Amino acid sequence: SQFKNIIVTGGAGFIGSNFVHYVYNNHPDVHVTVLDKLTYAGNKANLEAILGDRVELVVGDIADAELVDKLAAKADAIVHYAAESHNDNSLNDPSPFIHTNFIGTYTLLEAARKYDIRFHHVSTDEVYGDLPLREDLPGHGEGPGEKFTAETNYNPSSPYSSTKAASDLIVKAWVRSFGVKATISNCSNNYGPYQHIEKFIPRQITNILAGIKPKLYGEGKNVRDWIHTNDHSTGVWAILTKGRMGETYLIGADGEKNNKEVLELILEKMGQPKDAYDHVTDRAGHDLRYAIDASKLRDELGWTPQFTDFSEGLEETIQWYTDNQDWWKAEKEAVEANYAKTQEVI
Amino acid sequence: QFKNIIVTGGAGFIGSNFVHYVYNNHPDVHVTVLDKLTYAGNKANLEAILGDRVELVVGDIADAELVDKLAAKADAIVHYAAESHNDNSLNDPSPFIHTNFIGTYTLLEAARKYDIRFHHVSTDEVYGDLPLREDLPGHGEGPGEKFTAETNYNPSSPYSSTKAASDLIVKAWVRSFGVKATISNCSNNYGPYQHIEKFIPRQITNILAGIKPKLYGEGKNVRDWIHTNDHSTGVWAILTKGRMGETYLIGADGEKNNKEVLELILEKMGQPKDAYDHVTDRAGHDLRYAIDASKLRDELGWTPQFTDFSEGLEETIQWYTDNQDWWKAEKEAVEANYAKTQEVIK
Ligand SMILES: NC(=O)c1ccc[n+]([C@@H]2O[C@H](COP(=O)([O-])OP(=O)(O)OC[C@H]3O[C@@H](n4cnc5c(N)ncnc54)[C@H](O)[C@@H]3O)[C@@H](O)[C@H]2O)c1
Ligand SMILES: NC(=O)c1ccc[n+]([C@@H]2O[C@H](COP(=O)([O-])OP(=O)(O)OC[C@H]3O[C@@H](n4cnc5c(N)ncnc54)[C@H](O)[C@@H]3O)[C@@H](O)[C@H]2O)c1
Ligand SMILES: Cc1cn([C@H]2C[C@H](O)[C@@H](COP(=O)(O)OP(=O)(O)O[C@H]3OC[C@@H](O)[C@H](O)[C@H]3O)O2)c(=O)[nH]c1=O
Ligand SMILES: Cc1cn([C@H]2C[C@H](O)[C@@H](COP(=O)(O)OP(=O)(O)O[C@H]3OC[C@@H](O)[C@H](O)[C@H]3O)O2)c(=O)[nH]c1=O
Questions:
Q1: Beta bridge partners of A31
Q2: A156 interfaces chain B, CB cutoff of 8 Å
Q3: Nearest CA in chain B to A163
Q4: Residue A266 shares a structural domain with residue A229
Q5: How far is residue B150 from each of residues A250, B147, B243, measured CA to CA in Å?
C-alpha cells in the first residue's frame, strides 16, 4: 500500500488481469492503470467488471516510448506482465517475442530509470531450462539442483523462454548499472479462470465442452509445476511491497504433475472416457520437467500459497469454463485451426 | 571446411584481426565482411587486404534484406558485430539493444533459413563478476573462482546484458530449430587495431599525445588479458572443429589488475610511475574476470601462443607508436567524449 498509482502492463491477459482483480479487491488505496496492446491474448472482458475510477485501461504497446513516458510520469510503480507468452507461437513466429518481451521490457526499464520508480518484472521458471524426471534423479526431486532455485543457471530452450530470460538479464543489469528499483519473480505454470484457450488446461477443458478431442503432446510424460493464479498474485504483491531490491524470488506451490495425469483428471471430472483424446505431434525442443523451490519467498517474505489442492482448483477451473462459454466460444475454431497447421494425430 | 564466410563486424578490432588471420592462413577462403562502420569500424583496418579473398559490404546486421542477400551465398557466419564498450552503454544503451540483440536475432534467422554454420563471438562479461584472489580461499584456483562453461550468466551492464541475451537466443535457436551454432566467451583482448576508447590503447596513445593516462578509481579491477591473435585461432578452431550447440571459453591465464597494467605501460614508455590521473570510477564496475579455458584446450587442442604479456604489451605499444596516423584523428574526440562523464579525482 506504499504504491498508490501503479501501472500493470499486460493486465488484460490471464495472469495480469487476475492480479488487477487482486489489487482491486484487496488494496483499495491503489489506482491501477493497465497498459495492454490487446493482442490475440488480451481481452477487455477480463477487466470489464472493475474498470472505472479505480482501474483504467490504456490500449497501447509497451514498446511505444512516448506512451510509456506519459503513463510512467504519473505512476509510482510498474508491474510488468506484458509478454508474448506461448511457446508454440514462438516456434512458429518468434518476431513478436523479440519485440515485446525484450524491446518492450527495455522501454519500460528506461521509463522506470527516468522517473525513478519501482519496477517488478514478472517472469517464468522456463528461463532455467529443463530438468530430468524425478525417477531419473538421484534425490528423486528433493536433492540440491533437482528443483530450480534463485541460484539456478539460466538455460532457456525456446524463442519464448529465451526472450523472457533475456528480459530478466537486462532488468538485473539495470539494477546494478543504474540503480533501478527492480525485483524479479519467476513463477511456475499458472492455471485458473481467464486463461487463453491456446494453453494446455483450458484447451482440453474447452475442447471437451465443444465436442473436440483433447490433445496430448507425445506420450505426456512432461512435468509442469502447477500454481493457481491467485497464489501468483499474492506472491507478486509480497515481492512488490516487501522484496529486497535487485533480488529474484521464485514462486511455486509444490504442484508437479505430468501432462498425461492432468489430462486424465480433466477427462474424469468431465465424465469422459480415459482414452477419449488424441496424441499429437510433440513440440520442438519440448522442455521435460519444471519444478520450483519457493523457499526464499516463503521464508523471507512470509508468503504461502492457499490453493494447494490441485484437484479442487481444477474442478473450479472446469466449472469456470463451463459457466463462461460465451467468453471463449468464438475463439475456438481459429485456435484449433492454427494448431492444425503444425499438429497431426500420432 | 568453409569456403565463403561472412564476418560481421570485421572492420572493428577483434573482427579485423580475424579477417587478417583468414587472409594470411586460409587464402582459399573468401570472406565477406558485413560492417556498419560505426565510430568503431574503420576501413583502414582492412584496406590493405581487400581483394579477391576479402570484400567489405557496408551495412547493418539488423537489415534483414541485406543479410538475406549475403547469407544466400555463404556457408558460415562468424559474428563479431556489436556495440562493444561498457562506458558507452552506460551513457546510451539504445544501440546495444539494436545491434547486440536485434542484430544477432536477424543473423540467426538468416542462418536458420539457409541452414548455415553460425559462430557467435561473445565475452566473459556475461558471467558477471568475481572477487579478487586475495578474498578467495583458493586464491583464484579453487572451484568457482574462475568462470567455466557451467557458470551462471549474471551480467552487470547494458553491454554485457545484451551480449548475454544474444548468447541465450543463439542457444535457444540451436535447441528449437537446429541452427548449427557455436558460442565462444573470451576474456579481454588486446593488440593492434584496438579503438583508443579502450583501456590499453587509451593509455598508450594518451602518453604519445602528451595526455595523462586515466585509471578508474584506484585500479583494483582485474581483467584476464589475451592477445587478439590467440582469440582468432580460438575462433577458427571452434568454427572448424567445434561441437554444435557448445560454448567454449577462451582465455590465456593473464589476470592483472588495471594499476599493474598501467604501471607497466608507464615503465615501458619511460614515464614516471605516478604520471597518471585517477578518474571517476565506472557505475556497476565489474571487479575481476577470470577464464578457465580447459574445455577448449582439452577438446580442440587450442593453445595460446602469446602468453608473455610483457612482450605482447611491448609490441602493442610499438604498434600504436608506429601507426600514429591510425589513431590521431580520433584522440581529441574520444577524450572530449569521456570528459562529459569522467573527471580527475581530487
Ligand atoms: N501463464 C503462465 O503460466 C506464466 C508462468 C509465469 C509467468 N508468465 C509470465 O506472466 C506474464 C503474463 O502471462 P499470461 O499467461 O497472462 O499471458 P497472456 O498471453 O494471457 O497475456 C499477455 C498479455 O500481454 C499483452 N501484450 C502482449 N504484447 C504486448 C505489448 N507489446 N504491449 C502491451 N501489452 C502486450 C496481451 O495483449 C495480453 O493481455 C508473462 O510475462 C509471462 O511470460 C506466465
Ligand atoms: N574487445 C574484447 O575484449 C572482447 C572480448 C571478447 C569478445 N568481445 C566481442 O567481440 C566482438 C567484437 O569486439 P571488438 O572489441 O572488435 O569491437 P569494436 O568496437 O572494435 O568493433 C565493433 C564492430 O562492429 C561494427 N558494428 C557495430 N554495430 C553494427 C551493426 N549494427 N551492424 C554491422 N556492424 C556493426 C562496428 O562498425 C565495428 O567495426 C563483439 O561481439 C564483442 O562483444 C570483445
Ligand atoms: C497446448 C498443449 C500443451 N500441451 C503440453 C505442452 C506442455 O508440456 C504442457 C503445458 O503447455 P502450455 O500450456 O503451452 O504451457 P508451457 O509451455 O508449460 O508454458 C506455460 O507455462 C510457463 C509460462 O512461462 C508460459 O507463458 C505458459 O504458457 O502441456 C499438450 O500436451 N497439449 C496441448 O494442447
Ligand atoms: C577506458 C578505461 C578503462 N579503465 C578500466 C576499466 C576496466 O576495469 C578496465 C578495462 O576497461 P575497458 O577497456 O573498457 O574494457 P572492459 O570493460 O573490461 O571490456 C572489454 O573486455 C570485455 C569485452 O567484452 C568488451 O567489449 C571490452 O571493451 O580498465 C581504466 O582504468 N581507464 C580507462 O581509461
A1: A5
A2: yes
A3: B169
A4: no
A5: 21, 8, 16
Q: Count other Cβ atoms within 10 Å, centred on residue B333.
A: 12
Cβ distance B161 to A170 less than 8 Å, yes or no, reads yes
Annotated catalytic residue within A126, A168, A256, A287: A126
Q: Mind telling me how many Å the CA of B343 is from chain A's nearest CA?
A: 19
Indicate if A241 and A330 belong to the same structural domain: no
Is the residue at A344 inside a domain?
A: no
Experimental method: X-ray
* CATH number of residue A318's parent domain: 3.90.25.10
User: Do B252 and B316 belong to one domain?
Assistant: no
How many cross-chain Cβ pairs, A to B, lie less than 8 Å apart?
A: 90
- Locus of grid cell 521509463: A111
- Work out how many domains chain A is built from and give that number: 2
Non-local CB neighbours of B3 within 8 Å, separated by 6+ positions: B28, B29, B30, B75
Cα-to-chain-centroid distance, residue A23: 17
Contact (CB, 8 A) for B207 and B162: no
- C-beta A87 within 6 A of ligand 3: yes
B126 neighbors B171 (Cβ within 8 angstroms):
no
Question: Cβ neighbours of residue B326 under 8 Å, at least 6 residues apart?
Answer: B42, B44, B193
Say how many C-beta atoms besides its own lie within 10 A of residue B22's C-beta.
25
For residue A159, give the CATH number of its domain: 3.40.50.720
- Residue pair A279/A216 in contact by the 8 Å Cβ criterion: yes
Dihedral angle, C-alpha A314, A319, A320, A326, nearest 10 °: 140
What domain range is B61 assigned to? 2-195+223-256+288-310
Q: Is A47 helix (H, G, I), strand (E, B) or coil?
A: coil
Q: Domain check: are B60 and B95 in the same one?
A: yes
Distance from CA of B95 to the nearest CA of A (A): 12
Facing residues of A123 across strands? A186
Asked if residue A202 and residue A111 are part of one domain, the reply reads no
Shared domain check, A144 and A184: yes
Q: Is the CB of B198 under 6 A from ligand 4?
A: yes
Tell whether ligand 3 has an atom less than 6 A from the beta carbon of residue A196: no
> Do A17 and A114 have their domain in common?
yes
Grid coordinates of B262: 598501467
What resolution in angstrom units was achieved for this structure?
1.5
Whether B345 is covered by a domain: the verdict is: no
A 287-346 residues with CB < 8 A to B? none
Rounded (5°) CA angle B244-B245-B247:
110
Exposure of B285 in the CB half-sphere (CA atoms within 13 A): 15
| Cα separation, B165 vs B157, whole angstroms | 12
Going by the DSSP 8-state scheme, the letter that residue B284 receives in this structure is: T
In a domain, A345, yes or no: no
Q: Which residues of A are annotated as a binding site for NAD(+)?
A: 14-15, 36, 39, 61-62, 81, 83, 85, 100, 160, 164, 190
- Give me A283's grid cell: 513440440
Alpha-carbon A273 to chain mean position: 30
Cα(A236) to centroid of ligand 1, in Å?
14
CB atoms under 10 Å from CB of B139, counted, come to 11
Instruction: Tell me if A224 sits within 8 A of A261, measured CB to CB.
Output: no
Do A273 and A323 lie in one domain? The reply is yes
Partners of B101 on chain A (C-beta within 8 Å) are: 98, 102, 166
* Residue ranges of E strands in B36-166: 54-58, 76-79, 117-123
The answer as to whether B80 is a domain residue is yes
B149 sits in the region (left: phi over 0; alpha: psi -120 to 50; else beta) called alpha
H-helix or E-strand spanning residue B247: strand B247-250
